[PDB]
Structures are given as C-alpha cells and as structure tokens.
C-alpha cells in the first residue's frame, strides 16, 4: 500500500452506428477525408451551378471566352457597391474611361440557381482582395456599409452582401454581418 | 438513455433509411459507407433540414460530386434530424479531429455567433443531448433550438 | 475503395414513335426545321 492509487479512466466506447452488424461508415477513410469549409457550404453554389451560371451568361451577352472575364470583373465591382438582389429588370453598369456601359440583369439573376448571392460568393475572397487594394489609395467603403452606418475603416474590407462567413473570419467582422443580415 | 429516446430513430427506421438510400443511389454495400461519410460532413456544416429538392456534395480531391437529396429526406422517418443523430457521437469525434489542425467551426455556430472554440465540438443541429453532455454546451442548444 | 462512388445517370431512351418497325419522323431534319 505504498503506491498512491491512480484513478482508472473508463473508456466510453462511442456508439458507432450500424445497420445489420456491419458498420455504416469506414472510419479508415473518415480520418482522412478533409474538405474545406466553403466548398461544402450552401452559402456558395456548387461548381456545377456556377459553371451553368457562367456559360449561360456567356451566351446571353454573346461576348466570347477571351473577353467575358473582363465583364465578370465589372459584375463584381457592381455587386459590391449595390448588392446581389436587384430587380430582375434593369441594367448593371461597368465603365471604360467614363462612358458607362450597361448590360441587362435578366440573364444573370435568372440563371443564378438558387440565388445570385450564392453565385457571387465565389468572388468573396477576390472581393476583399479588391477592397483592400482600393482603400490603399483613399478611403473607400462598400455602400453596404454606408447604409448600415459602418465607419470602422477596417471592416470595409468585409462589408458586402455576399461575404461567406467561413471559419477564418476575423471575429471583429463576423458580428457585423449577423447584426445586419 | 439514447437508445430509447425519440431524438434518435429506432434501429428499424434507420435500417430502412439506409437500405432505401443504398437502393436509390445504387452504389453497393462495399462503397456506400464512403458516401455516408460525406453525408455526415455535409450535414454538420449545413444542417439536417434542407429542401427536398437539391443536391448535397462530397469531394474526391476537388471535383465536387453531387447526390440527390430527395431519396434521403423522403425515406427519413420521421425526420432527417433523428436519423442523422445516429452519427452524433462520431460527429463530435470528427470535429475534435478537425480542430486539431486548425480552427474549425460548424457553420451552425457561425450563424448563431459561437466562438467558444471549445463548444465547436458540440455545434451541429443533430446533437442528441444525452445525459453525459458537458453542461457548458447543453445551454447552447436549448438557447438556439 | 479509395475512389468516391459517382452515381450513374440512367438513360431514358425517349420513345420515338414508329408504325411498323421503321421510324415515323426523320429527326435528321427535325433538329434543323425551325419556323417562326
């Protein structure tokens, strides 16, 4: 009785689900299957829906693979400032120089399954990588902020309707979206 | 406590909900497990009450693969939540493994403003509050649910 | 068993109408005939 007694740690065999004696899962793989948080979320559309929403818009405008990118570059900047739920009728605008050029919104909002927000979320990372660049020159704030009274200056990078709150969001901002959304 | 609760479906209902889905996909006993592995991870992040129409996704590499939701939600008696609860214990045993590498949080938390870091293990719609729940978390579900 | 299983898309052979073994239409043209 010279050895102090150490409490034994009972082992709670987790209840692995089964159907008829065999196991349902194959943990052998479960411990290796590791996706990314965004790519299985619903805040983004599957790469199928996005592939459709890109081919269909590439068709309605009838521009061409070589130049359609430059158009999408505009759609982001437009969405950032205004939002991602406009009237199906109407025109979004992009500019060369100062000659505003309009495009019809119908082919975009219509072919966006289930909604434009999701589809535009595919540019979320690039969106913040664009606002950061913009603010460097001068103080810029997504309008989404100007209507919600945001003047952090640091939260401007994450102020637009189609930011996907992933897991790597500085929490100084995650609060903003839920409060507004 | 779990095996007589209603938050889990009887082993009959679950046995049906597994055979029926094994049929609709027509995959095979050998590989259906790997699919169910995806359904959990999908349910964890999104929930367990999606539109009967639509597709849940699982990935090999980065080529998202879609499956139809209809055969799952339909054959789940009385609801998907219950059926998915059979993976509750494995679910937490999966989140714990995930957080080790980096900070991960079920989306169920991100929408409910959860940033405990320790409660992430128990943040998903289909956790069965058994009797062995650390009470630091039992409060979360009732407040949200 | 390292490859995720992809569901096969069964192919619903539309029932092209026929009379006595031969086909009634001539899709060869149907896919080009386009009126207003």
Author numbering:
A (entry chain Ab): 41 to 221
B (entry chain Ac): 77 to 221
C (entry chain Ar): 41 to 76
Q: What do the paper's sentences say?
A:
Potyviral CP plays a role in virtually every step of the viral infection cycle, from transmission of the virion by aphids, virus assembly and disassembly, regulation of genome amplification, protein translation, to cell-to-cell and long-distance movement. CP consists of a highly conserved globular core flanked by two large extended regions with a high frequency of structural disorder. The C-terminal high intrinsic disorder region (C-IDR) is partially conserved and packaged in the lumen of the virion, supported by the helical ssRNA scaffold. Here, we show that we can control the shape, size, RNA encapsidation ability, symmetry, stability and surface functionalization of nanoparticles through structure-based design of CP from potato virus Y (PVY).
We prepared VLPs consisting of the CP units lacking 40 C-terminal residues, i.e whole C-IDR (CPΔC40), and analyzed them by cryo-EM. Interestingly, we detected only two different architectures of filaments. 65% of them had the stacked-ring architecture (VLPΔC40:r) and 35% had left-handed helical symmetry and encapsidated RNA (VLPΔC40:h+RNA). The structures of the CPΔC40:r and CPΔC40:h+RNA subunits and the helical parameters of their VLPs were comparable to those of their wild type counterparts. In contrast to the VLPΔC40 formed in bacteria, the filaments produced in vitro were architecturally nearly homogenous, with 97% of the RNA-free stacked-ring architecture (ivVLPΔC40:r).
